[PDB]
Amino acid sequence: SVIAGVFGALPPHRYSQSEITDSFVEFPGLKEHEEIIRRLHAAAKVNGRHLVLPLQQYPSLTDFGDANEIFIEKAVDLGVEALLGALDDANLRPSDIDMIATATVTGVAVPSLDARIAGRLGLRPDVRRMPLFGLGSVAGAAGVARLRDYLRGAPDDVAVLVSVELCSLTYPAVKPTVSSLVGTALFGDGAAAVVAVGDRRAEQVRAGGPDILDSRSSLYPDSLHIMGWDVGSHGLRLRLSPDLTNLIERYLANDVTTFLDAHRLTKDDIGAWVSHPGGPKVIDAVATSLALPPEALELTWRSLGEIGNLSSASILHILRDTIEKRPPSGSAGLMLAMGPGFCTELVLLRWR
Amino acid sequence: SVIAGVFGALPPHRYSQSEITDSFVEFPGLKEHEEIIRRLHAAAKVNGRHLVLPLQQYPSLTDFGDANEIFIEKAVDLGVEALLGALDDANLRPSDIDMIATATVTGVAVPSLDARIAGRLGLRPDVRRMPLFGLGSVAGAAGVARLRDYLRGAPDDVAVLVSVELCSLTYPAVKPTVSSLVGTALFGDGAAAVVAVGDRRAEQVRAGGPDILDSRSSLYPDSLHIMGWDVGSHGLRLRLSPDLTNLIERYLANDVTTFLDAHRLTKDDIGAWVSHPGGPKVIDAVATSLALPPEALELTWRSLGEIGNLSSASILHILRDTIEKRPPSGSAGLMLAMGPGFCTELVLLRWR
Ligand SMILES: CCCCCCCCCCCCCCCC(=O)O
Ligand SMILES: CCCCCCCCCCCCCCCC(=O)O
C-alpha cells in the first residue's frame, strides 16, 4: 500500500468569511441572532470558504429534496474532478482502478456516488465498489486505512478513495441553535481523492506518495451524542455536543500511545502531523493532549483558515499540503481524524 | 475466507399477505385503488411478511423523522440479534470480531449501525468498521464479497457482515403510484448476519460454512434510473423501472459466463444457486436468461413466499436455508444479486 496520487477540488465560488457572515445574518429568520452569529463566525478562525452555490441563493434553499438533488449533481462533478486530478498526479488511468471507495455524510444517494462517479469516468464494469456513509469527519483517515486493508490482500491492484462533502447544502436543516450556528461558522464545500497502489504495483507505477503502514480505530463507549445527524423532513440536522473537546483532552493521548507503542515509536518520532481541522477548540485540544509545538499542526491551521472545515475531505487537502512540503525522507507520519461514533482514527505513514 | 456462521433475524409480527392486503386497502387514501393493490399483492408470490410495527400502526407513520428514528431504534435491535445468532452458530464471541461491515438502504444512521451494534455487543474499541449504504438489494452478495476481500489479506482474522432492512418504515414516502404499490406488494422487514474467518483461522475455529472463493461485480452503463430512491422531505420514495427484467434477460447470461470461465466452470458445474428474490418477474428472468431447471431457484421461491423481499438480507436467509440443505460436499455454490447501479454481484462458493 503506497499512495501514488492525492488531489483536492473546490467549487469556484469563493467568499471571505465576513462576506458570508454579512449576508447570513440577513437570511430569513436569522436577524434575531446577528450577535451570536457574528461572534461564532469570527471565532472560527476561517478566513474564507468555497460554496457550491452562489451565496445569494441559499435563503431559497429550504426544501430538503431540492438540496439533496443538487448535492447529487454537484457532488458527482467535484468527485470526478478530484479523482481525475489524483490520477494525473499518479500518472494512471481510470481503466486501471480495481476498487473505488466513496465517503460523504452530507448527501443521500442511491445509487451511491461510486456508481455515478464510475459511470462518468468509464471505469471497468467489474470495479469493486465501497460507499461508506455513516463515517463523516473521520472518513478521510478511515478511508485511506480501508484502502490499505484492501491492497493488503490485493498487492497488484490500484484502489482509490473519493471524498465529497458539500456541507453548505445541508442548509434546509439549519436552525438558530448553538450547535447549528457553530456548523455555520466552520464548514465549507470541497472534494479530495487518493489514488493508492499495492506493494507489488508501486515500483512500476513509480508510486511517489508515502507508504501506508498501519491504522487504528478507536470507538469511545457511550458517546453517540457527540456527533451525528438528526434526520428528518427538514433533512440532515447537526448534533454537536459541547463535551467533544473534553473527550479528546481525556482520551486522545491513550489512542496515540497505544498505537505508536505497537510500532515502538514515540510522539517525537513523528516527522509530520496530518490532523483533521475540526475547529479552533478541537485543534487546541489535540495540541494540548499530545503536547505538540505550535508548528506541529500548522498546516491544518492553515487549511482551516483558507477553506474552512470540509468534513472528511479536509484531512486529505492537508495531507496533500504535507506531501508538497516534502517531509524528511523516511520519517514517520501520523494521520489523526475524528467523527461520529464517537471515534478517532489513526494512520501511520512513511514519507519517501 | 470461510463462512462459519449465518443467521436470520425477523420481527415477531408475521402477517399473511391477505391479512396485509385487507387492512392496507382500508388505509387512508388507498381505498380508491383497491383493485390494483389486490392485483399486485396477489401476483407477488408472497404469502406472508414480518413487520417491525403492528400492521395497524402504519396509517399513522407519516413523518419521515419518526420513521427514521424508529428505524434506528429497531434496526440495531434486529442487527445485534442476527450477529449474535451467527456468532453462536460460529462458536465465536463478539470480541473475536476484527472488522464489522454494515449494509442497509432503508434508514439513515449517523453514527452508523456498525458503531451502534459494536457499542451494544461489546466489540473491541478498535474494530474495523465498514458502513455500506446505497448498495441496496445487491448488498448481501457484495457484502460477502468484501468479506473475502478483507480476509484475503488477514488469514487470522474474523470479519462479520450485518444486513438490516426495514422496508416497511419507508411508508411515509409511499403513495398510490404504480412502482410504489409494487413495493408494498413485495417488501418485508428482517435482518441477517454472516460470520467469516481467514484461511488460517479457519482450521482453528473449525469453520463449517462454505469457502468464499471469488466474486465479480457488473455495473451496467447508463442504468442509474433502473432502481434507487428519490430522497426528499417525505423520506425514501422507491424508483423501480419496468425495464429491469429486460436488462437481466439481455446481459445476465454473459455476466455469468465470463465469471465461470475464469474457473473452468459451466452452469452445469454449479451445485447450488443462491439467488436474490427480486420478485416473480425477476426470478423468472434469471431462470430464463440462464437455462435453469425449476428446482434450481426453489429455495429463493420459498423464501420469497415465506417472508417477502427483504432487500439485501434475503439472499443471506436463502444462503442459510441452502447451507441447511447441504449440497454435494465439495461442489460449487453461486450467489447472484442485483441492485441500484444498475449492477449484479456473483460470488463463487464451495460447500463442505
Ligand atoms: C452557507 C452555509 C454553510 C454552513 C453549512 C450549514 C451548517 C452545516 C452543519 C453541518 C455541515 C457539515 C457537518 C459535517 C459533520 C461531520 O462530518 O460529521
Ligand atoms: C404496510 C407496509 C408494507 C410494506 C410497504 C413497502 C413500501 C415499499 C418500499 C420498499 C422499498 C424497499 C426497496 C429496497 C431495495 C432496493 O432499494 O434495492
Curated annotation (Swiss-Prot), chains A, B:
Enzyme class (EC, first level): transferase
Catalytic-site annotation from UniProt: S137 (nucleophile)
EC number: 2.3.1.-
Protein name from the UniProt record: Methyl-branched alkylpyrone synthesis polyketide synthase-like Pks11
Plastid as UniProt keyword: no
Coiled-coil region list: none
InterPro entries with a match to the protein in the record: Chalcone/stilbene_synt_C, Chalcone/stilbene_synt_N, Polyketide_synthase_type-III, Thiolase-like
Keyword Acyltransferase listed: yes
Described function: Involved in the biosynthesis of methyl-branched alkylpyrones. Pks11 catalyzes the extension of medium- and long-chain aliphatic acyl-CoA substrates by using malonyl-CoA and methylmalonyl-CoA as extender molecules to synthesize polyketide products. Palmitoyl-CoA or a similar long chain fatty acid derivative is the likely substrate in vivo.
Gene name linked to the record: pks11
Keywords: Acyltransferase, Fatty acid metabolism, Lipid metabolism, Transferase
Residues engaged in binding substrate: S179, L240, H276, P277, G278, G279, P280, K281, S311
GO BP terms: fatty acid biosynthetic process; polyketide biosynthetic process
